[PDB]
Each structure stands twice: as C-alpha cells, then as structure tokens.
Amino acid sequence: PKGTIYLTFDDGPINASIDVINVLNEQGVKGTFYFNAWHLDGIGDENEDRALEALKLALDTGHVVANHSYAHMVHNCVDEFGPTSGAECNATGDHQINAYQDPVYDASTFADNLVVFERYLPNINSYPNYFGEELARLPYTNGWRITKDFKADGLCATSDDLKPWEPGYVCDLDNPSNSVKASIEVQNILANKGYQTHGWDVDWSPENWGIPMPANSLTEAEAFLGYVDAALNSCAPTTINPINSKAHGFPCGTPLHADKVVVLTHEFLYEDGKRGMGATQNLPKLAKFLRIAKEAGYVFDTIDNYTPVWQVGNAYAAGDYVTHSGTVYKAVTAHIAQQDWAPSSTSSLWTNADPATNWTLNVSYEAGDVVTYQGLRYLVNVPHVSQADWTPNTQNTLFTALS
Ligand SMILES: [Ca+2]
Ligand SMILES: [Mg+2]
Ligand SMILES: [Mg+2]
Ligand SMILES: [Zn+2]
Fold this sequence. Notes:
Residues 3-301 form the NodB homology domain. This protein is of the alpha/beta class.
C-alpha cells in the first residue's frame, strides 16, 4: 500500500453532511466524523434542521462518529453562551481568540457532547462504529494523544489576543498563549478519561479565503493528491501552514505514523450557500479525489484503526501498538495473537501504553515519568511494570510524591 489515508470531517452533523456521506458511500470509503452536538439543538448557525438525519446516516452506513465537543468551544468566543452565540461568533470571526479558558469546563463539554447524542439517539451505544467516548479532536488544535510516547500539541493553535495574520502577532513556542496552555490541559484531561486525540497531516481547505465565495477555491482533486503525496512520511504536522495548524513536538519518524496521512476537512465546504458553490463545485472534487487516490495505490481507513485494533490470528512484532477495547497496548514480543493472549492489565505479552498520565496497571514506567494517583503527583524513580500491589501511595521507593 502506497499509504493509508484517514479522511476526516469536522463540525457536523449538518445538512451538508448527508451529501458528503452519500459521495463517500458511492466511492466505497469510510470517513471519521468529529461531531458537535449543538447542531442537533439547532443553535450551531448552520443549515442543520437535518442534523439528526445526518447523524443517523453516518451511523447506519458505517462511518466512525467521534467527539469534537458540544459547541466547538464557542462559549469561550462570546460573553454569555446562548442560542445566538454561533451567529455572534461568526460575525466577529474570533473563534481562535481565548478559545480555551477554564480547561476543566472546556474538557467537560466533550462529556456534554455525549449526553446530547444519547438523548437524541438512545441506541447510539449499540453501534460498533460509535467512538464518541474513545476518539476526540480539539477545536482549532493540531494536538495528538496517541500513546504514552506519541503526543503533540499545537503551541500556536489559539491566541490570547491577535490572530496569526494581524500585525504584531507573536508565537513564543516556549511561552505559549494562555489559551494554548489551557488546550494542553484539555488534551491531558481527555487522555485520562480514555480518549485518543488525533490532529492532521494536511487540511483540504480553500486556498484563497479572501474572495467572495471562498469555498470555490478548494484545492482541485489532482493537486490535493499531490499534497497527500508530499505529506507521506514527511512529518507534515510540523511543516504544515499556516502557523496555527502546526503540531509541535510531533515524534517525526515514529512507526505508528509511517505511511499514513490524516486529512482534515469540513462538510460545510461542500454546500451551496453562504461560503460559495461548495456542493456543485467541491462534491465532484471529493468524488474524483477518492477515485484517483485509490488508483494511485492509497487505501482509506478510519481513525479507530489508526492504532490497529487487536485481532485473533494477526501477527505482531515486538513494539507494535494495538488498541483493545479502547485501551492502547504495546507488544512485548513477536507473536501471533491467540484468543487467550488478548491484551489485559496483567498480560505478559502486552503493556498498557495509553497516552494517559494517571497511574495505570501494566504500564512500562521509566524513571522520570510522572503519574497522578488519588489526587497526588508522583515521580517514577525506578523503571518497572506497574501492578495492583505497587500503587504509588504505598511504594515509597518506586515513587516519590511531588508538589
Ligand atoms: Ca472513558
Ligand atoms: Mg489551542
Ligand atoms: Mg481509550
Ligand atoms: Zn473544528
């Protein structure tokens, strides 16, 4: 396989999501959808009266539904959050300014997202492709929480005042904005709740936001496959433009990211409406891109298999990462998965490698790691594989309590 493309769509479910899903379905391709449930409540400032229909269609035709937070952090964009906030925030266009403030509350709007989904679609948890509890992406932020050793944050993703193009904008990578620092704590809170978060390698976006109908300038299918080619094995999350889209500290050649390209785009770019002739002009771009990427040797997959799901009969090499019932695991030795050797919290074949920082069972801890346990932070003094008898509060020799 030339490579595996993960085509992902943010900010639905809206009416245009239906057209996008139909094109994906026609071309035999599954997408990952990072949804904001406030479109179900009718307050997202889009064409969204068919949002519930769109949510159902994504579930019924096998796409992966993931968590993009209830209201896309726009409660942080305006004074008081209400039915008109999406409209108000679209009028100033200040989505990235003070986007993250109280990280505990901001992180909890990902939990609110799931409560709303389950109120509108009570059986949503009977769908195997519903990953609202396991997969998230932060609004505006090319930040990653994949494994204990695969993480990245965009340190310029949001600002305390100026936008990246406004004169006087500065991004000090080792003194980032308060909004960025808050978004980092949000990533960490979500990982401690079991989430993986995925950023993106390339953004399928209007290449001229200036003109009256910016959607029309969405990169042509052929040119965009050129960008996907360039993103392959080139650590594109750190080289992407503009500056607020970079992921900093990305572990460039890490094996879990090899031969993979995560594409970010938005259904609202494939709609005929306020942003231009998106449907009649960009929907054909999407269909053609799907066909020519397949023709070139690419394969399309969904973010739930980005970290391959463990399966009986598969072969693993020492160091391969899998995901098993939502938990990330690293292989201790080369082997062929047999049904009794599933990863677990006491398996000697697999260790837990969740990107979480709370003390966890069966983690291969290194000296210098820091874990959180019963509200306290502990430094790991001595490398060890954690186990239930070795909790930090008692193992005064393996761990040292901090602050
Ligand atoms: Ca959870
Ligand atoms: Mg941010
Ligand atoms: Mg998980
Ligand atoms: Zn978004």
